[PDB]
Design an enzyme around this catalytic site. Sequence first.
Site, PDB file in Angstrom:
ATOM      1  N   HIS A 198       0.935  -1.123  -0.024  1.00  0.00           N
ATOM      2  CA  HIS A 198      -0.161   0.147  -0.113  1.00  0.00           C
ATOM      3  C   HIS A 198       0.561   1.298  -0.003  1.00  0.00           C
ATOM      4  O   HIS A 198       1.817   1.531   0.712  1.00  0.00           O
ATOM      5  CB  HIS A 198      -1.127   0.259   0.879  1.00  0.00           C
ATOM      6  CG  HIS A 198      -2.145   1.285   1.067  1.00  0.00           C
ATOM      7  ND1 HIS A 198      -3.214   0.643   0.649  1.00  0.00           N
ATOM      8  CD2 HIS A 198      -2.147   2.506   1.663  1.00  0.00           C
ATOM      9  CE1 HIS A 198      -3.725   2.410   0.685  1.00  0.00           C
ATOM     10  NE2 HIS A 198      -3.292   3.113   1.015  1.00  0.00           N
ATOM     11  N   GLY A 199       1.233   1.890  -1.081  1.00  0.00           N
ATOM     12  CA  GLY A 199       1.432   3.171  -1.070  1.00  0.00           C
ATOM     13  C   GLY A 199       0.599   4.587  -0.994  1.00  0.00           C
ATOM     14  O   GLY A 199      -0.908   4.216  -1.053  1.00  0.00           O
ATOM     15  N   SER A 200       0.995   5.172  -0.637  1.00  0.00           N
ATOM     16  CA  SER A 200       0.639   6.833  -0.255  1.00  0.00           C
ATOM     17  C   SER A 200       1.438   7.923  -0.135  1.00  0.00           C
ATOM     18  O   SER A 200       2.611   7.862   0.006  1.00  0.00           O
ATOM     19  CB  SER A 200       0.119   6.490   1.152  1.00  0.00           C
ATOM     20  OG  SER A 200      -1.081   7.574   1.346  1.00  0.00           O
ATOM     21  N   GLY A 207      -1.633  10.366   9.346  1.00  0.00           N
ATOM     22  CA  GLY A 207      -3.292  10.130   9.417  1.00  0.00           C
ATOM     23  C   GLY A 207      -3.048   8.282   9.673  1.00  0.00           C
ATOM     24  O   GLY A 207      -3.577   7.449   9.945  1.00  0.00           O
ATOM     25  N   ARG A 214      -7.989   3.282   6.249  1.00  0.00           N
ATOM     26  CA  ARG A 214      -9.743   3.720   6.093  1.00  0.00           C
ATOM     27  C   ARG A 214     -10.767   3.662   5.053  1.00  0.00           C
ATOM     28  O   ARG A 214     -10.307   3.657   3.738  1.00  0.00           O
ATOM     29  CB  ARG A 214      -9.943   4.395   7.108  1.00  0.00           C
ATOM     30  CG  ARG A 214      -9.471   5.523   8.523  1.00  0.00           C
ATOM     31  CD  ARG A 214      -8.821   6.331   8.542  1.00  0.00           C
ATOM     32  NE  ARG A 214      -7.437   6.165   7.791  1.00  0.00           N
ATOM     33  CZ  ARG A 214      -7.295   7.749   7.425  1.00  0.00           C
ATOM     34  NH1 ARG A 214      -7.289   9.527   8.033  1.00  0.00           N
ATOM     35  NH2 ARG A 214      -5.356   7.498   6.931  1.00  0.00           N
ATOM     36  N   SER A 240       2.218  -0.348  -5.984  1.00  0.00           N
ATOM     37  CA  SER A 240       1.729   0.505  -5.181  1.00  0.00           C
ATOM     38  C   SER A 240       2.536   1.756  -5.004  1.00  0.00           C
ATOM     39  O   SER A 240       2.394   2.503  -4.441  1.00  0.00           O
ATOM     40  CB  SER A 240       1.723  -0.149  -3.369  1.00  0.00           C
ATOM     41  OG  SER A 240       0.822  -0.913  -3.371  1.00  0.00           O
ATOM     42  N   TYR A 243       2.013   4.846  -6.142  1.00  0.00           N
ATOM     43  CA  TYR A 243       0.738   5.868  -5.812  1.00  0.00           C
ATOM     44  C   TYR A 243       1.443   6.825  -4.258  1.00  0.00           C
ATOM     45  O   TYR A 243       0.607   6.892  -3.414  1.00  0.00           O
ATOM     46  CB  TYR A 243       0.054   4.945  -4.910  1.00  0.00           C
ATOM     47  CG  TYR A 243      -1.254   4.805  -5.882  1.00  0.00           C
ATOM     48  CD1 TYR A 243      -2.261   5.720  -6.135  1.00  0.00           C
ATOM     49  CD2 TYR A 243      -1.241   3.515  -5.981  1.00  0.00           C
ATOM     50  CE1 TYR A 243      -3.560   4.677  -7.240  1.00  0.00           C
ATOM     51  CE2 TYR A 243      -1.745   2.903  -7.017  1.00  0.00           C
ATOM     52  CZ  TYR A 243      -2.889   3.783  -7.562  1.00  0.00           C
ATOM     53  OH  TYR A 243      -3.706   3.157  -8.831  1.00  0.00           O
ATOM     54  N   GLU A 326      -5.090  -6.527  -8.100  1.00  0.00           N
ATOM     55  CA  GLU A 326      -5.143  -5.483  -6.909  1.00  0.00           C
ATOM     56  C   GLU A 326      -6.204  -6.391  -6.246  1.00  0.00           C
ATOM     57  O   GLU A 326      -6.949  -6.889  -6.599  1.00  0.00           O
ATOM     58  CB  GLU A 326      -5.518  -4.024  -6.993  1.00  0.00           C
ATOM     59  CG  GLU A 326      -6.856  -3.886  -8.250  1.00  0.00           C
ATOM     60  CD  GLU A 326      -6.801  -2.586  -9.046  1.00  0.00           C
ATOM     61  OE1 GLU A 326      -5.773  -2.255  -9.510  1.00  0.00           O
ATOM     62  OE2 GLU A 326      -7.371  -2.090  -8.569  1.00  0.00           O
TER      63      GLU A 326
HETATM   64  N1  D7N Z   1      -2.947   2.742  -2.885  1.00  0.00           N
HETATM   65  C1  D7N Z   1      -1.869   1.560  -2.984  1.00  0.00           C
HETATM   66  O1  D7N Z   1      -1.216   0.554  -3.248  1.00  0.00           O
HETATM   67  C2  D7N Z   1      -3.007   1.243  -4.140  1.00  0.00           C
HETATM   68  C3  D7N Z   1      -2.442   0.157  -4.807  1.00  0.00           C
HETATM   69  C4  D7N Z   1      -3.444  -1.334  -5.538  1.00  0.00           C
HETATM   70  F1  D7N Z   1      -2.888  -2.148  -6.134  1.00  0.00           F
HETATM   71  C5  D7N Z   1      -4.663  -0.466  -5.906  1.00  0.00           C
HETATM   72  C6  D7N Z   1      -4.300   1.186  -5.375  1.00  0.00           C
HETATM   73  C7  D7N Z   1      -4.374   1.609  -4.606  1.00  0.00           C
HETATM   74  C8  D7N Z   1      -4.672   2.351  -4.315  1.00  0.00           C
HETATM   75  O2  D7N Z   1      -4.669   4.093  -3.033  1.00  0.00           O
HETATM   76  N2  D7N Z   1      -5.839   3.065  -5.218  1.00  0.00           N
HETATM   77  C9  D7N Z   1      -6.642   3.620  -5.340  1.00  0.00           C
HETATM   78  C10 D7N Z   1      -6.747   5.054  -6.199  1.00  0.00           C
HETATM   79  C11 D7N Z   1      -7.570   6.137  -6.025  1.00  0.00           C
HETATM   80  N3  D7N Z   1      -8.917   5.356  -6.681  1.00  0.00           N
HETATM   81  C12 D7N Z   1      -9.952   7.098  -6.573  1.00  0.00           C
HETATM   82  C13 D7N Z   1      -9.906   7.288  -7.707  1.00  0.00           C
HETATM   83  C14 D7N Z   1     -11.926   7.563  -7.631  1.00  0.00           C
HETATM   84  C15 D7N Z   1     -12.090   8.171  -6.361  1.00  0.00           C
HETATM   85  F2  D7N Z   1     -13.088   9.466  -6.900  1.00  0.00           F
HETATM   86  F3  D7N Z   1     -10.955  10.057  -6.841  1.00  0.00           F
HETATM   87  C16 D7N Z   1     -11.342   8.219  -5.754  1.00  0.00           C
HETATM   88  C17 D7N Z   1      -9.676   7.391  -5.412  1.00  0.00           C
HETATM   89  C18 D7N Z   1      -9.276   4.386  -4.946  1.00  0.00           C
HETATM   90  C19 D7N Z   1      -8.360   3.566  -5.505  1.00  0.00           C
HETATM   91  C20 D7N Z   1      -5.863   1.675  -5.494  1.00  0.00           C
END
Ligand code: D7N
Length: 351
Positions: A198-200, A207, A214, A240, A243, A326
């Site tokens: 999970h990347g961010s 948070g 969350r 990830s 992100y 995913e």
């Molecule tokens: N954060 C992660 O590591 C990650 C890893 C994955 F394989 C896939 C995803 C993520 C990640 O954060 N994802 C989020 C990226 C953003 N989307 C949405 C896109 C539509 C919105 F309305 F803006 C809400 C956010 C929700 C999923 C997909």
Amino acid sequence: ESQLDLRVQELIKLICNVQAMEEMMMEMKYNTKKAPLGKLTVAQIKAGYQSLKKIEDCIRAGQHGRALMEACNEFYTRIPHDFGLRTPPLIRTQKELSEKIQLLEALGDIEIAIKLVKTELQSPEHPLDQHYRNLHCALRPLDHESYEFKVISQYLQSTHAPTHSDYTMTLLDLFEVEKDGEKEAFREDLHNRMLLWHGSRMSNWVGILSHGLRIAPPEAPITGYMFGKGIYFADMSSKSANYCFASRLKNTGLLLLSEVALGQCNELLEANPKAEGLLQGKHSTKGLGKMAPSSAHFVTLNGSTVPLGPASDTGILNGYTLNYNEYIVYNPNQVRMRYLLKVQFNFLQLW
Ligand SMILES: NC(=O)c1cc(F)cc2c1C(=O)N(C1CCN(C3CCC(F)(F)CC3)CC1)C2
């Protein structure tokens, strides 16, 4: 002076940086100085989602003219932005919409993170130790020569997609994570427990480490969520990692690994924003990627499966097809955060 290990002090100083939260909001044209987070109302934020819904409606129907311009004016009315001089731009694509939707969530999140970093009126204690304490999340640095660091580095390197060749990644430090309350709440009973990425963004970690990961709030538009409102993980590190939004100027990002209780996956080939409704007894959604680590290479770490790479073709094909898996769960009780990786992104200039 700080009683923390030095590696933790650097980690804490990095994520608790208030400027960096201001600058991230400013990039999304929100001025925290001109418009203090503390003054946003519950009803104001709800009205903002309401206008983003009208914008989404326009966009999904290809309407870019007058209805869209009014919906955007109504959004900028409700949520104060700072454009310097320019004409406020139209929110026209899914990327720009989605930035706004994330902005709205971050307003409440950043506000609580900034309250978190406030030190006590009187206290001789080093601010790093107070910040650390206030997270309520143990962060235990591991040595580079230890088995666990070597395994995690393999998983980081072996699952960096061949199609994300714009950078490499170096593991600077690795912390084992023990978030208060997560062990006791965890669905220890569920089979198919996997250790997943999970990347961010850098400003999100205060948070995440204080609240855990969350689901998105009830009021956010559902149809942006390709598999619903849950927590999203990859089995590919670079997916990830994308992100983190690291950059050349700030080439340090964090990756989180969590033990995720997947139970029986509802496997889906194609996006479905209503995916959570489709469960009927199952526990998670898996979006089926074209490429993927194969179970022959998998090891274990504390009874979670670690899906080591390299990735190989899975024979899934379609319409649209996911590049890599995913995974999605719909209750934080299916997640137990476990390692946090401090990662140096090395960007490449390729043509
Ligand atoms: N954060 C992660 O590591 C990650 C890893 C994955 F394989 C896939 C995803 C993520 C990640 O954060 N994802 C989020 C990226 C953003 N989307 C949405 C896109 C539509 C919105 F309305 F803006 C809400 C956010 C929700 C999923 C997909």
